[PDB]
Design a protein around this nucleic acid. Structure first.
Ligand SMILES: [Ca+2]
Length: 276
DNA sequence: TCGACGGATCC
DNA sequence: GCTGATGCGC
DNA sequence: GGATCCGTCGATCGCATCAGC
């Protein structure tokens, strides 16, 4: 069936009002997405922090419109070391973070511009574009090694500060996270290896899947639809974009949104509300 | 994602 | 700047 | 032997590069 995001709950389980609004969006081509007026949508949504994945855009080709974006002035970008127009992530923030860093600290996994880490007063924000297992699972073996290094890195981080992980994690955790699970158990993003990796990521860091913690049995909630076969028209999709939270942060969780109607990509944006 | 393919295998 | 082909995706 | 059942296996869209001039 089709899906309507419920309204934004902007008070916490204790009634404290949300102080912090984080939007995450795989823009699948930053320049194409700006040409498709996504930046307008970002302006009307007005996040305190915007995380972008799959920018496919090197630092010096960044369009001018991003400078004229005065509520998200502190901007950080990561592109692959030697693969142009591939991958890429950015982190735009209203307030200046204490410390920004790139990658997870493992040479093998830090060459494709996928991870930005931004340290704030009371939490640490990681945004990531996870490597896709590949058509015909050509990179599924590399991906399990990423999963373990990423798990290890995030666990280390979360031991020092409450952690918010957001972005495209390239896996539908459970069968409820995609429209046709039975046909995709051998396609990238729904292999047993990928769903197990996600489960261990939740278990080992540990982290809670914010959306699923709030809406544990809501089906048809997806963040991605392939461009082909009018899949978004029919809501034949996958939930690949998450906010994963330190359990410490659950009493701060106000809501976790899926902005199904915002166009500009084959991913829609997701928005997180915290009382901090 | 969807389909046309097969090569199975049922009534 | 323009064509045409290739890489990469969930 | 003529219908179904179910595993492949290509071809769909979109962004971006690259080779060449
Ligand atoms: Ca490829």
């Amino acid at each position: 069936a089709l899906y309507e995001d419920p309204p934004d709950q902007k008070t916490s389980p204790s009634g404290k009002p949300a102080t912090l609004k984080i939007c995450s969006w795989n823009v699948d081509g930053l320049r194409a997405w700006i040409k498709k007026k996504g930046l307008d949508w970002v302006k009307e949504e007005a996040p305190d922090i915007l995380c972008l994945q799959e920018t496919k855009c090197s630092e010096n080709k960044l369009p001018a419109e991003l400078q004229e974006l005065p509520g998200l002035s502190h901007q950080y970008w990561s592109a692959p070391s030697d693969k142009e127009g591939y991958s890429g992530v950015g982190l735009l923030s209203r307030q200046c973070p204490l410390k920004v860093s790139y990658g997870i600290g493992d040479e093998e996994h830090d060459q494709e511009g996928r991870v930005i880490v931004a340290e704030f007063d009371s939490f640490v924000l990681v945004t990531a574009y996870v490597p896709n297992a590949g058509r015909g699972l050509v990179r599924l073996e590399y991906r399990q090694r990423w999963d373990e290094a990423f798990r290890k890195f995030l666990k280390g981080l979360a031991s020092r500060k409450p952690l918010v992980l957001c972005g495209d994690l390239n896996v539908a955790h459970e069968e409820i996270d995609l429209r046709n699970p039975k046909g995709n158990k051998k396609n990238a993003g729904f292999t047993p290896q990928e769903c197990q990796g996600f489960g261990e990521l939740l278990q080992a860091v540990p982290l809670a899947d914010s959306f699923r913690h709030l809406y544990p049995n809501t089906p048809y909630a997806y963040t991605f639809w392939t461009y082909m076969m009018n899949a978004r028209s029919k809501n034949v999709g996958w939930r690949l974009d998450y906010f994963l939270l330190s359990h410490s942060l659950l009493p701060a969780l106000c809501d976790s949104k899926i902005r199904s109607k915002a166009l500009g990509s084959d991913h829609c944006p997701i928005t997180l509300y915290l009382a901090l």
